[PDB]
Write a protein that binds this ligand. Structure first.
Ligand SMILES: CCN1CC[C@@H](COc2ccc([C@@H]3c4ccc(O)cc4CC4(CC4)N3C(=O)c3ccccc3)cc2)C1
Ligand SMILES: CCN1CC[C@@H](COc2ccc([C@@H]3c4ccc(O)cc4CC4(CC4)N3C(=O)c3ccccc3)cc2)C1
Lengths: 218, 218
């Protein structure tokens, strides 16, 4: 694919924005939301170029390592234009007072604010989210396994090329392109941090459930 | 500073390689080693360009967030040329059988192997380690605080420029430069992951101890 075809494919693959299911006229809400998003996550992952080329075992491993980071970056992206609040759903917009939960809440807000300051574009966001899917499990995986890693690194490389294409397209200098690429990728370290803190706070989709959702028939 | 002056400064700032203190003729060893390295860590941090320009409070916060990542990347760097082992010290080279410890052990080995495959250069390593110091605490911090963040981001940007300079210097194409920059920075997400897993396994230098070591007289 060209760089522009990568962007188009990623933008069309975007999952829908789900609603919280509480009676409008009247933690479980957050858990219920995450349950429903996971199914659409699977469908999104299978449309990330190169992902379905992996073994089903490798797909499960990547989704198992990445799922909370992917939910968290989606949240931070939705919340960008809502200073001081997290848009868990269009009908569930909470501030820090409504949130060990407030510690994680404050980190998500700070990431949303950093996105705001950098003026993160939707095209960049979908590249970052695909990078999370491919990268988060790649250091925790046979000849076929060596081939699986090479492929993942080639796909990651093409997303890097795509991010740079977007920035050159927008008129950034070569220096500004590298600098913004680095700033975006360092935010992924903070998203990993939050995911780890969140996985600590949650003590989770099982391998078998993920495999059951990924191991589709035709 | 020029890019080449950044590299020289960072290389000279490198801390010494400490030895384990056990009687050669005959977890505490790992803890003792980390205690001694922390003091040299402080001295190293104060020589990272731009770090001492921060408030003492901001320096402490950054070191508090980064210290285990910095110890871990140093370990992975030392261990690169020792497949299957971790060189905690020149006299303490352990394999995974000698190591919830083995889970973290295996992640460090995998990072060392990834460094090996990419042929990480010492000049790149010192850039990455400085990036960890400046980035790991920056999303968890007043007008002076806004000025502190701008400065940190400017220093981070200059290290990005330096990494690219090193890669262009080595003859990489512009495409290969961006791709390698991205590959290096994504490894920092895995180092953060390991640090979080390690901080979980350790349940640590206090704020006051760090401040006491950083709040030097003349
Ligand atoms: C029944 C089985 N399932 C499969 C395993 C399990 C699901 O685990 C969950 C539960 C809740 C969440 C929500 C949630 C929801 C939607 C969203 O888009 C993002 C998030 C983000 C997020 C901080 C991470 N969160 C929290 O509640 C939170 C906590 C403390 C501070 C702030 C926020 C995420 C995952 C239940
Ligand atoms: C007395 C007060 N101090 C201040 C707080 C506290 C210090 O905490 C420590 C203790 C130990 C370590 C060592 C250590 C040492 C040197 C090195 O260069 C790197 C590391 C890396 C590392 C995995 C992270 N580690 C482990 O033991 C390990 C565990 C499980 C699997 C593999 C390795 C790091 C930090 C004690």
């Amino acid at each position: 694919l060209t760089a522009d075809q990568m962007v188009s494919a990623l933008l069309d693959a975007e999952p829908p924005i789900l609603y919280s299911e509480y009676d409008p006229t009247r933690m479980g809400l957050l858990t219920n939301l995450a349950d429903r998003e996971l199914v659409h996550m699977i469908n999104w992952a299978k449309r990330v170029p190169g992902f379905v080329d992996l073994t089903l075992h490798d797909q499960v491993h990547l989704l198992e390592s990445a799922w909370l980071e992917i939910l968290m970056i989606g949240l931070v992206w939705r919340s960008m234009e809502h200073p001081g609040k997290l848009l868990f759903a269009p009908n569930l917009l909470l501030d820090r007072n409504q949130g060990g939960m407030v510690e994680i809440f404050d980190m998500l807000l700070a990431t949303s604010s950093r996105f705001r300051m950098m003026n993160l574009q939707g095209e960049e966001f979908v590249c970052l989210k695909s990078i999370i899917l491919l990268n988060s499990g790649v250091y925790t995986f046979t000849l076929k396994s060596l081939e699986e890693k090479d492929h993942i690194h080639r796909v990651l490389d093409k997303i890097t090329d795509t991010l740079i294409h977007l920035m050159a397209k927008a008129g950034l200098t070569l220096q500004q392109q590298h600098q913004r690429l680095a700033q975006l990728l360092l935010i992924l370290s903070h998203i990993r941090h939050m995911s780890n803190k969140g996985m600590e706070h949650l003590y989770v989709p099982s391998y078998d459930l993920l495999l059951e959702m990924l191991d589709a028939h035709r």
